[PDB]
Design a protein around this ligand. Structure first.
Ligand SMILES: [Zn+2]
Length: 386
């Protein structure tokens, strides 16, 4: 069978917001055990030598706690050494991203450093990408990319987020089944209180690279903020604080997903648990961005055997308030006749519009993505032949 459950979680070094000063790997492990993912990506896992505030060897402890549950394949991808602990640099400390899996790796993990040149020219490394292939029974090889980007704490940090993301995306091959997961530290849309926010731009790059935001395919983004403290708060900006993601390549369909509420106060982030299903090899995958500068959303078309078509259309505009605009995708024949139209309205807090049907792309077909005004006027249009 073709199901895959993928979880991502920033575990805050297993220190719970409801119990400061206690390192509690069992609480983290119990949530993972209950969610029973095939593969889990963890951020903020330390591997520290002894000293004031040390977290010890967290990957080894998590592996010990989860071995009997089948998570016997683990990889730690170093991101940073010698971090402040309790107000002082702790020698021999380190942070990593971790992949844990019930299924064996093919080869080993590879770590790619991600720069912070704008924040600190010539400074220490702080962020990295971990890539490892997992051989999943029934599916075959799935490439897992695990990362954690800088926080958007300033204009220079956002410039670093952009450079980090470029490198991450250039390491994803959408031609093979892959997932990209972790704390990307970006909303899907520009933060209105930050003039230097460039989230719409970054999301357009991810979509151009044939990656689908899996949560947004099946759920309202506004129902899944991933900061624990934001969960359950309808007031702005809380429903927008979804910053932990699972992205998937076109071969995957998204079945369902949820934020983990087994023990919500175990970390200051919520775990994101996605149920995916691997289809056949895509025969075509194309993204057309929407809006005059390609910043208002997108349409992603996937064709696969036998004769299946999928169109995922996303309006990536607005937070609390719907301006009445819509993103519309039209599949047209060579004559320009509409074969199918799929539209997404609402705001970035609302689920994307995904349609799947039986059909074949005729020769000379093209895909159009438009931004449509509230009055029905076409504000922008972009078309690409297939
Ligand atoms: Zn530590």
């Amino acid at each position: 069978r073709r199901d895959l459950r993928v979880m991502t979680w920033n575990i805050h070094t297993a220190v719970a917001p409801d119990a400061p000063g206690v390192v509690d790997e069992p609480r983290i492990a119990a949530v993972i055990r209950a969610e029973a993912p095939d593969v889990v990506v963890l951020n903020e896992v330390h591997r520290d030598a002894p000293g004031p505030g040390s977290h010890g060897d967290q990957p080894a402890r998590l592996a010990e706690l989860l071995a009997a549950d089948g998570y016997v394949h683990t990889w730690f991808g170093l991101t940073e050494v010698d971090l402040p602990h309790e107000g002082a640099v702790l020698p021999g400390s380190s942070n990593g991203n971790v992949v844990m899996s019930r299924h064996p790796f093919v080869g080993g993990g590879v770590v790619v450093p991600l720069p912070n040149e704008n924040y600190e020219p010539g400074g220490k490394l702080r962020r990295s990408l971990l890539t490892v292939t997992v051989d999943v029974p029934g599916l075959g090889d799935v490439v897992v990319h695990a990362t954690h980007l800088s926080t958007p704490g300033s204009a220079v940090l956002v410039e670093d987020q952009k450079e980090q993301l470029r490198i991450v995306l250039d390491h994803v091959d959408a031609r093979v089944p892959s997932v990209l997961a972790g704390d990307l530290n970006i909303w899907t849309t520009d933060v209105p209180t930050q003039p230097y926010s460039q989230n719409n731009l970054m999301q357009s790059w991810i979509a151009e690279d044939h990656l689908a935001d899996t949560w947004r395919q099946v759920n309202d983004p506004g129902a899944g903020p991933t900061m624990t403290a934001s969960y359950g708060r309808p007031e702005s900006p809380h429903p927008d604080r979804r910053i932990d993601y699972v992205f998937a390549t076109p071969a995957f369909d998204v079945v369902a997903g949820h934020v983990s509420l087994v023990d919500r106060f175990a970390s200051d982030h919520l775990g994101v648990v996605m149920d995916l299903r691997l289809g056949g090899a895509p025969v075509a995958a194309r993204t057309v961005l929407a809006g005059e500068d390609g910043l208002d959303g997108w349409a992603q078309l996937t064709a696969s055997r036998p004769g299946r078509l999928r169109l995922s259309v996303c309006k990536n505009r607005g937070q609390a308030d719907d301006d009445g605009t819509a993103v519309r995708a039209v599949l047209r024949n060579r004559a320009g006749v509409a074969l199918r139209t799929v539209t997404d309205s609402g705001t970035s807090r609302d689920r994307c519009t995904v349609e799947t049907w039986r059909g074949a792309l005729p020769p000379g077909a093209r895909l159009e993505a438009c931004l449509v005004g509230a009055d029905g006027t076409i504000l922008a249009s972009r078309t690409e032949t297939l």
